C-alpha cells in the first residue's frame, strides 16, 4: 500500500456539540494535541526513517479526525519513498489540513530528540486519594450540583482516573485530566465522583473533555476555566484536548506515565 | 455489564512450535525472557474507587509457554470493573495467573504512577547503525543477508537499529521495534546486519520469535563467541513485549522505556 490520503475519516465536532447546547461561538477556545508514535516511511534510497509527530489541530477547526483513519494512513506512509523529511511533513500538514477543515500544526522529530526527556505528571493537587464509596457507575453531571460554594480562588486539581469507553471499539480510554480555573472553591468529592461517573460512558477524548469543561462552566461558574486530558495512545496514536476560556495552547506537551 | 476478573482468557503459545522452525539444539542456544511492561492496569478498591498503575512483568524464556498478547490485554481489562481489597492482591493474582499461563514462575512489579515522575526515556547502548547510503528496494526476509557477513578482527561491539519492523500475524498489522546487538567475535559488515534487519519488514512473526530468530541467524552465519539480541517492540493495546537472550547474560539491567514506546 502506497501513501493514499483518502483514508482520512473527518468527523465534525458539531455532532456533540450539539448535544452539549454549544452555540456556534464556543464557550472555549483550544487544540488537541495528537502525538504520533509510529511514524515510518522510506527515503529517497528505500531505506525505512522512523520519527515522532507532533500535530495540533485547532478546536474551531469544523472536524477532528477519527483515529483508527489516522492510523491507517499514516501506514501508507511505511512503504512509500520521500525525497526527504520536509517533504513527510509538507505532505502531514496539508493532507491534515484538509481533512480538519482549517490548517494544522505538525513538527516531525528524530527520535534522538527525546533521549533523556522526562517522564511529567500534572500540576496542582491531586485529588485522587480519597476514601470515598462509588455505588453506581452512570455519567451523572448533576454530581456537580452546588460543587463550587468556597471562596474565590485560582487552583490547578488534577485526577488519573478518568476512563471512558471507545465505543466504536468497544474499548477503554485512559486519561489524566487537569483543572485550573479562578472562581469559587470546588468540592474535591464532587468533582472526582463526577469524572468516576465517565467510567461507562461512550465517547470520544475531545468529546469527553469538551463535556467536562462546559460541565463544570454551568453548575460551577468559574470565572476563568482550563481543562486538558492526556490519553492513553489508542494504535500509536495519543490525543491531548485542551479547552480554555482565554488559552489558545497549553504551555508544555510532555509525556505522562502512562502515555 | 463489562466483564470481570477472568483468568481463563489468558492464551498461552508454547515456545517450541515457532523454535522448531529454528532447528534448535536439544538445550537451547540462548537464555534470557521477556519483559511486558503494561501501561494500562486498573481496577476498583473494596469500596469502588478506581486504581490505576503499571505493571512490568518478566517471563523467563525457559517458560513452556509464552503469552499472546491479545488475550494479556483482555485478561487485564477484565479487572477493570472488579474490586479487590488491596493491590497486594492484585500482584499476587498476576504472579499467580501469569505463571500458570506460562509454565514457570514469572515476576511481577506493580508500580504507582508516581514512581515514574521524572524516569527518562532512553535509547540503546553502543553505536546506531541506521544512518548508511545504502539503497533497499527488496523488503522480503532473507536470512541469507548475513551470509559472509563477519569478516572482521575479533572485537567486542554493541551495535542498535531503530528499524526492526515485522507484521504482527494475528492481525496483520505492522509492528515496531528497536534492537540491540552485543557480541564478540568477527568484527560484522553493517550494512548486510542493517538489510538483514529491513528484511522483516514484511516478515510474519511473535516479538519474542523475531528475536530468536536473529539470535540464532547471527550465531549461523556470524559465529561470536558471545551474542546478546534484544528488542524493545511499540505496544500493542497497552501492552509492550522486550524479548532478551543471550549466550552468556540473564536480563536487561532496566525497563526503562524508549522514544516510540
Ligand atoms: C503480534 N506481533 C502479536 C499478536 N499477539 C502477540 N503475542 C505475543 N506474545 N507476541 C506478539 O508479537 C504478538
Ligand atoms: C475512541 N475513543 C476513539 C476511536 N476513534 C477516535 N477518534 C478520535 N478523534 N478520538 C477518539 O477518542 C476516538
Not at 477519527?66 to 511505511?78: I, P, V
Not at 469538551?210 to 454551568?218: G, L, P, V, W
Request: proline letters at 4%; one cysteine or more; a negative charge.
Amino acid at each position: 500500500n502506497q501513501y493514499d490520503p483518502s483514508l482520512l475519516q473527518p468527523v465534525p465536532r458539531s455532532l456533540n456539540r450539539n448535544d452539549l447546547h454549544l452555540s456556534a461561538t464556543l464557550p472555549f477556545q483550544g487544540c488537541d494535541i495528537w502525538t504520533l508514535y509510529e511514524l515510518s516511511w522510506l527515503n529517497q534510497k528505500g531505506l525505512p526513517q522512523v520519527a515522532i509527530g507532533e500535530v495540533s489541530i485547532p478546536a474551531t477547526s469544523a472536524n477532528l479526525i477519527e483515529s483508527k483513519s489516522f492510523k491507517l494512513y499514516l501506514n501508507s506512509y511505511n512503504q512509500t519513498r520521500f525525497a526527504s523529511w520536509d517533504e513527510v511533513q509538507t505532505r502531514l500538514v496539508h493532507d491534515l489540513s484538509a481533512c480538519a477543515g482549517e490548517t494544522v500544526t505538525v513538527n516531525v522529530k528524530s527520535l534522538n530528540e527525546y533521549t533523556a526527556e522526562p517522564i511529567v505528571t500534572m500540576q496542582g493537587e491531586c485529588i485522587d486519594d480519597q476514601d470515598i464509596e462509588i455505588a453506581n457507575y452512570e455519567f451523572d453531571d448533576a454530581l456537580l450540583q452546588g460543587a463550587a460554594q468556597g471562596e474565590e480562588v485560582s487552583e490547578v486539581l488534577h485526577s488519573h482516573l478518568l476512563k471512558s469507553n471507545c465505543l466504536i471499539t468497544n474499548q477503554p480510554d485512559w486519561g489524566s485530566v487537569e483543572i485550573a480555573y479562578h472562581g469559587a472553591k470546588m468540592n474535591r468529592e464532587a468533582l472526582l465522583r463526577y469524572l468516576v461517573s465517565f467510567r461507562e460512558h461512550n465517547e470520544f477524548h475531545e468529546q469527553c473533555v469538551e463535556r467536562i469543561f462546559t460541565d463544570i462552566m454551568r453548575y460551577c461558574q468559574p470565572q476563568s476555566l482550563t481543562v486538558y486530558a492526556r490519553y492513553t495512545r489508542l494504535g500509536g496514536l495519543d490525543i491531548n484536548p485542551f479547552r480554555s476560556s482565554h488559552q489558545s495552547a497549553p504551555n508544555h506537551n510532555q509525556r505522562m506515565a502512562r502515555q
